[PDB]
Amino acid sequence: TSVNERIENKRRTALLGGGQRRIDAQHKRGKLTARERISLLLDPGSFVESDMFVEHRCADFGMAADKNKFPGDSVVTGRGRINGRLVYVFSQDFTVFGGSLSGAHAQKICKIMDQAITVGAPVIGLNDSGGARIQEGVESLAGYADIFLRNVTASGVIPQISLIMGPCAGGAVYSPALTDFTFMVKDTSYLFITGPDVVKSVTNEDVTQEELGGAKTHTTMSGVAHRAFENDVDALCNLRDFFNYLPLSSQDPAPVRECHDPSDRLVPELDTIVPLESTKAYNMVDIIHSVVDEREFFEIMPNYAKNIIVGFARMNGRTVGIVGNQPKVASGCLDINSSVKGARFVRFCDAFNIPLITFVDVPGFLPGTAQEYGGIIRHGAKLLYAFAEATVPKVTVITRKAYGGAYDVMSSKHLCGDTNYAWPTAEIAVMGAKGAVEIIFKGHENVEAAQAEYIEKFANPFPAAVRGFVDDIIQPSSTRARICCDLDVLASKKVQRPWRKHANIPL
Amino acid sequence: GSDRTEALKRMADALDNYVIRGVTHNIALLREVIINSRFVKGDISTKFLSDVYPDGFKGHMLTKSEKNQLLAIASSLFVAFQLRAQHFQEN
Ligand SMILES: *C(=O)CCCC[C@@H]1SC[C@@H]2NC(=O)N[C@@H]21
């Protein structure tokens, strides 16, 4: 056998992976293989695979046998482009040793992370594993340590996107916790530290795989996964479109893309969304959809902390992040869960120079022992900090209510905001007229007259505007045009801040 | 219009350029009835719709040439979005 023949056989084996019968199982299971997934993700013909001939060096427990020598060692790594833009990817291959992590496995992933940091290119990981490769022992633990170090170092330098498309257990579960966004695939992906076998052995509780770490749990109740997609093909199609929003590095401005939607059009549909009756809820999403370019909005965690809306959109071609209250759910009140989702989203957009638009309608905080015992004070400070720290353009629109300390938490002008607009129905106060009059006028005669006088003077947007809290009071139909104008002039804004070794968010 | 065919053709055009979104509307029914061969000829009785749609309204039925035009439009529009996605400011 010649050298060239050996090489050709090594290429064909790396392409097959764990063997055709294991591929057949993956397809029976409704899953794509690691190499098929890359072909869908990246532009045709743009993918360049690295280190395809790397094999493990473990010789213990029979691992020195030729029957265990799978070139590629369970990961596909390399670089490519999505719509002409450079991206680094890796995808874990479940057909070779179960997708378990070896020393060399982690290495290959680390090397492309080092290039991505060096050139300033994003990294997308497609995760699917069973955990560490116990046959090597502590080399897989060193593998995890090296990946974790890169994931932390890359934070704020390049965006890191993780899509989980299968099981995930052991140390693998912490890389999505270090990246910026985590997505899952409904009823196909799992994310858990230990399996149901350990849970039942430790505590006398019964649980199945879908209940312990299923995609529905992590997108609806734990707040870990940002969005689950129906299947592998739809998940990668939406991932490509999501990719188009983000810059390649934090040194880059928010991407600007060709846009046909005139920036100066009016939106008459906004003038009557907000009811005059204070106890009538409305859907904030109707406002978000009508303002954003071509009515396209990418919603993050649609099923978790529904009282606050966060997501991506484009206005006049430029990527922006949108945060707003949802009065339809829990009167639009802040709670622990909403503060966690908000702070994380805001922090990402600030780090990568993506402007923020805030739609405020918040009557206060959710009362009760469930929130007080949960540390609502500690968690609420997370959203206040996330806005106060921001140095990217911030445009706030107040649609109806902003009572109490929630006014400042939801990116008020006094946290170094750029512009703040009020709609005619906006009301800014420490509390509603009923509470304020009962406290201010206590024991006096003709309280009912005092109630009428207070409402006429303070139950509107004027006592705040005349003080400099609001820059203008605008007709809702003009909101989009007003925001577009601010975005196109604040984009070159820089501010100074004292030197710090690093930030100290309340956590 | 000046004649029966001009008024009907102009009506067909107005219905396709008439944007209603947010509710369910009945434009599909209006657009098909006015182009029905019995309506253009005039063989209309007060029970016209009950004999044309004996099993309910189903929607406009496409012929061979119309399906090819719809597929060509849908495919070209799909690509038009894919090409717009590639036009970035110069970095
Ligand atoms: C009735 O008296 C209950 C009042 C609750 C109104 C809302 S709920 C959360 C905010 N906190 C508060 O004191 N008022 C607001």
Question: Which residue reads 């532009």 in tokens?
Answer: A43
> Do A420 and A453 belong to one domain?
yes
Q: What are phi and psi of A161, to 5 degrees?
A: -115, 130
Whether A257 sits inside 8 A of B91 (CB atoms) is no
**CB neighbours of residue A413 within 10 Å:** 17
Structure tokens at A164: 């989980």
Using CA atoms, how far apart are residues A346 and A392, in angstroms rounded to an integer? 10
Using CA atoms, how far apart are residues A109 and A21, in angstroms rounded to an integer? 26
> Do A229 and A280 belong to one domain?
no
> Do A225 and A305 belong to one domain?
no
> Do A212 and A281 belong to one domain?
no
> Do A241 and A329 belong to one domain?
no
How many domains does one find in chain A?
A: 2
How large is the angle between the packed helices A433-440 and A447-458, nearest 10 degrees?
130
Q: Which ranges in chain B belong to alpha helices (H)?
A: 4-16, 27-33, 37-41, 48-52, 64-84
Angle of CA points A95, A208, A212, to nearest 5°: 85
Query: According to the entry, how was the structure determined?
Result: cryo-EM
- Reported in sequence order, the residue ranges of A294-434 that DSSP labels E, i.e. its strands, are 298-300, 308-315, 318-325, 356-362, 394-403, 419-422, 427-429
Q: Looking at chain B, after which residues does the C atom sit over 2.5 Å from the next written N, breaking the chain?
A: none
> Do A173 and A265 belong to one domain?
no
Give the active site residues of A. Answer: 170-171, 405-406
A394 close to A432: Cβ distance less than 8 angstroms: no
Contact list in A for residue B78 (CB cut-off 8 A) is none
3-class secondary-structure state, position A117: helix
A366 in contact with B, Cβ within 8 Å: no
Å between B26 CA and nearest CA of chain A: 22
Q: Phi/psi zone of residue B55: left (φ > 0), alpha (ψ -120 to 50 degrees), beta?
A: alpha
Whether residue A393 has its Cβ less than 6 Å from ligand 1: no
- Among A225, A240, A257, which residue terminates a domain? A257
Which helix (H) or strand (E) segment holds residue A124: the answer is strand A123-127
A286 in contact with B, Cβ within 8 Å: no
3-class secondary-structure state, position A391: coil
A111 close to A79: Cβ distance less than 8 angstroms: no
Using CA atoms, how far apart are residues A108 and A17, in angstroms rounded to an integer? 16
> Do A153 and A297 belong to one domain?
no
Nearest neighbour of B84 by CB, restricted to A252, A256, A258: A258
Which range of residues forms the domain containing residue A265? 258-507
Atom of ligand 1 nearest to the CA of A366: 9
Whether B86 sits inside 8 A of A255 (CB atoms) is no
Q: What are phi and psi of A398, to 5 degrees?
A: -105, 120
3-class secondary-structure state, position A358: strand
Spatial CA neighbour of A400 closest among A274, A279, A306: A274
Whether residue A363 has its Cβ less than 6 Å from ligand 1: yes
The residue whose CA has the least distance to atom 2 of ligand 1 is A435
- Among A220, A242, A257, which residue terminates a domain? A257
> Do A227 and A312 belong to one domain?
no
B76 in contact with A, Cβ within 8 Å: no
Contact list in B for residue A252 (CB cut-off 8 A) is 91
> Do A232 and A306 belong to one domain?
no
Using CA atoms, how far apart are residues A118 and A111, in angstroms rounded to an integer? 11
Ordered DSSP codes for A206-260: ---HHHHHBHHHHHHTS---SEEESSHHHHHHHHHHHHTTS-SSTTSPPPBB---
A44 in contact with B, Cβ within 8 Å: no
Cα–ligand 1 centroid distance for A362 (angstroms): 11
> Do A236 and A363 belong to one domain?
no
> Do A302 and A402 belong to one domain?
yes
Whether residue A332 has its Cβ less than 6 Å from ligand 1: no
Q: Which amino acid is at A129?
A: S
- Among A237, A257, A277, which residue terminates a domain? A257
Query: How many interface pairs between A and B have CB atoms less than 8 angstroms apart?
Result: 22
Nearest neighbour of A244 by CB, restricted to B85, B89, B91: B85
> Do A217 and A308 belong to one domain?
no
Using CA atoms, how far apart are residues A314 and A354, in angstroms rounded to an integer? 10
Using CA atoms, how far apart are residues A283 and A297, in angstroms rounded to an integer? 15
Using CA atoms, how far apart are residues B56 and B49, in angstroms rounded to an integer? 9
